[PDB]
Amino acid sequence: ADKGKCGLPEIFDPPEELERKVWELARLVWQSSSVVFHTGAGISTASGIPDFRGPHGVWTMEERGLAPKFDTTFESARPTQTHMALVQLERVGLLRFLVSQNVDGLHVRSGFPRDKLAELHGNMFVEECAKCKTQYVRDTVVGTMGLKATGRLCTVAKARGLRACRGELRDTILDWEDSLPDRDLALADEASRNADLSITLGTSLQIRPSGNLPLATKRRGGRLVIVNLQPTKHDRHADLRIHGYVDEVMTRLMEHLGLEIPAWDGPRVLERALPPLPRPPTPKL
Numbered sequence: 530a531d532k533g534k535c536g537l538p539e540i541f542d543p544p545e546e547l548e549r550k551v552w553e554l555a556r557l558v559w560q561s562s563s564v565v566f567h568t569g570a571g572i573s574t575a576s577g578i579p580d581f582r583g584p585h586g587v588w589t590m591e592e593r594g595l596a597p598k599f600d601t602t603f604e605s606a607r608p609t610q611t612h613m614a615l616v617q618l619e620r621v622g623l624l625r626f627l628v629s630q631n632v633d634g635l636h637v638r639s640g641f642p643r644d645k646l647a648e649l650h651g652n653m654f655v656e657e658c659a660k661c662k663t664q665y666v667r668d669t670v671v672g673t674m675g676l677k678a679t680g681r682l683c684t685v686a687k688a689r690g691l692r693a694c695r696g697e698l699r700d701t702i703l704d705w706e707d708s709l710p711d712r713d714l715a716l717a718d719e720a721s722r723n724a725d726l727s728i729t730l731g732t733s734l735q736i737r738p739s740g741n742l743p744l745a746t747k748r749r750g751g752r753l754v755i756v757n758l759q760p761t762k763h764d765r766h767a768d769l770r771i772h773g774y775v776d777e778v779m780t781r782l783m784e785h786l787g788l789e790i791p792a793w794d795g796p797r798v799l800e801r802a803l804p805p806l807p808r809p810p811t812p813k814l
């Protein structure tokens with residue numbers, strides 16, 4: 530019901546200030562042992578999916594009697610340069626965990642390992658069995674929202690001393706009254722608490738507890754970086770505030786780290802993370 534502060538004017542750091550901040554972000558990534566990324570709707574706007582509270586966000590346009598515009602369907606949407614840069618950061622061991630508030634399903638489809646991802650608000654391609662909690666990552670969007678029945682049944686077969694489920698499959702999109710999934714929130718909180726660096730990308734941090742998770746890093750002595758075009762709810766607690774397009778920030782960061790942004794060969798689901806791949810040596814700083 531309460532959609533928060535919508536349509537706040539955008540902030541842009543000057544070119545030289547922006548370049549200096551991305552180099553400082555590279556320094557923090559190089560020096561940190563546990564990096565947790567927190568993503569919101571801002572990292573998918575470059576793929577044609579509107580955010581919620583930006584100048585033309587879903588809530589912003591709705592409040593102003595206008596309609597949000599989609600430049601793609603969720604099925605035809607492709608991961609942005611930022612989505613693919615996060616895949617590479619995890620692959621080389623520069624990303625410990627990823628906390629997302631996005632329901633667009635792009636992190637999973639980009640090939641990001643699900644065991645290092647917390648999808649706090651759901652995934653429109655994911656349906657879950659109401660009984661055994663088995664999740665099904667579908668190639669098309671699940672046609673319901675609000676944890677409603679989809680019409681499909683669980684298909685987990687009989688084992689030794691265990692029979693077939695046939696449980697009701699339901700969407701994972703939380704409605705306003707619904708509580709956050711316990712396992713995702715517990716894993717997101719554990720990772721945030723143990724992080725020495727939390728980086729937020731394209732989130733106004735207005736939703737609780739989701740938006741408060743990066744503060745769990747700061748209270749334990751860790752550092753907080755906020756990357757966003759608009760002001761956020763927790764700007765005062767950030768060690769570094771970067772006001773720019775997340776694709777420009779992430780592309781410059783990847784160049785600084787000597788890392789290439791990997792190719793996306795279509796929707797692919799990766800359940801578990803692998804040991805880190807080789808990465809370029811660290812500068813003296």
Ligand SMILES: Nc1ncnc2c1ncn2[C@@H]1O[C@H](COP(=O)(O)OP(=O)(O)OC[C@H]2O[C@H](O)[C@H](O)[C@@H]2O)[C@@H](O)[C@H]1O
Binds near residue numbers: 572580630650756774
């Ligand atoms: N290319 C870009 N680069 C950097 N920042 C951007 C870009 N595009 C947009 N932004 C910023 O990105 C920010 C996006 O913030 P919000 O729109 O609130 O999305 P959320 O993920 O935090 O919303 C959380 C939940 O609230 C909802 O109810 C749903 O349940 C959501 O899951 C804005 O401040 C933009 O300025």
Ligand SMILES: [Zn+2]
Binds near residue numbers: 659660661685695
């Ligand atoms: Zn089941």
